[PDB]
Design an enzyme around this catalytic site. Structure first.
Site, short mmCIF file in Angstrom:
data_model
loop_
_atom_site.label_atom_id
_atom_site.label_comp_id
_atom_site.label_asym_id
_atom_site.label_seq_id
_atom_site.Cartn_x
_atom_site.Cartn_y
_atom_site.Cartn_z
N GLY A 31 0.82 -1.19 0.00
CA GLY A 31 0.00 0.00 0.00
C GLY A 31 0.86 1.25 0.00
N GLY A 32 2.09 1.15 -0.52
CA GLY A 32 3.01 2.28 -0.56
C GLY A 32 2.46 3.45 -1.36
CE1 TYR A 51 1.22 -10.49 -2.62
CE2 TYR A 51 0.29 -9.32 -0.82
CZ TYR A 51 1.11 -10.32 -1.29
OH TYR A 51 1.81 -11.09 -0.38
CG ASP A 89 4.20 -13.53 -1.44
OD1 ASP A 89 3.83 -12.34 -1.71
OD2 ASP A 89 3.64 -14.16 -0.47
CA CA Z 1 3.83 -0.97 -1.39
#
Ligand code: CA
Ligand code: CA
Lengths: 122, 122
Positions: A31-32, A51, A89
């Site tokens: 969520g950067g 994601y 991942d």
């Molecule tokens: Ca991020």
């Protein structure tokens, strides 16, 4: 799941990996915001976007199927949604390994407040 | 150092602690932004402000002196600056323990993008 991501990072990058990678740059984590700082951070940018592409299951929470032998990770299982998570991942860990030579402790636990600029879109 | 913070968190909160706490809410980690989400997040807010008060040494990087016996942490050593760092970390871990009953996985790896509002000042 993010727990399994941390296990993977551990396996591939070493014991210090989870602390070293899951607060780095503007994106390492989730969520950067803002602009990726360097190649490692772009690994997590791509991870985030990855994601973002998972529909039908939860990439943060749901458990996938993977194996760890002789130093690397292979994603398995017959639930394609969970394997899609695993692949996000796995790719991200290999990307961290590939870019280890430009890892810069300047960006370790870099604040959010240092990434307050327009965000690069997926 | 943040490595020692992770060791402390591990010791006090359990093996899953480092992953559980070092990307949570708007502040867990360092250099956060916005409004603390809940009591746990306020633990890290106060932690951030605490590191902000350390002059003469580096709270992220420098190694302090601590002991771990029968479940809790005590800061030691005769370098007061390093002990000030240790105290920031110690306080923060006890704060996580004290608030464990309101820990909400909603805020685990909460994005930066969910904390883009005016920041509370130290
Ligand atoms: Ca991020
Ligand atoms: Ca913070």
């Amino acid at each position: 799941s993010l727990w399994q991501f941390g296990k993977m990072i551990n396996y591939v990058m070493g014991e210090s990996g989870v602390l070293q990678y899951l607060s780095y740059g503007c994106y390492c984590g989730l969520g950067g915001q803002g602009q990726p700082t360097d190649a490692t951070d772009r690994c997590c940018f791509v991870h985030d976007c990855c994601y973002g592409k998972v529909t039908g299951c939860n990439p943060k929470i749901d458990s996938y199927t993977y194996s760890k032998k002789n130093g690397d990770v292979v994603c398995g299982g017959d639930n394609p949604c969970k394997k899609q998570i695993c692949e996000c991942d796995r790719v991200a860990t290999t990307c961290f390994r590939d870019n280890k030579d430009t890892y810069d402790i300047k960006y370790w636990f870099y604040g959010a407040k240092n990434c307050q600029e327009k965000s690069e879109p997926c």
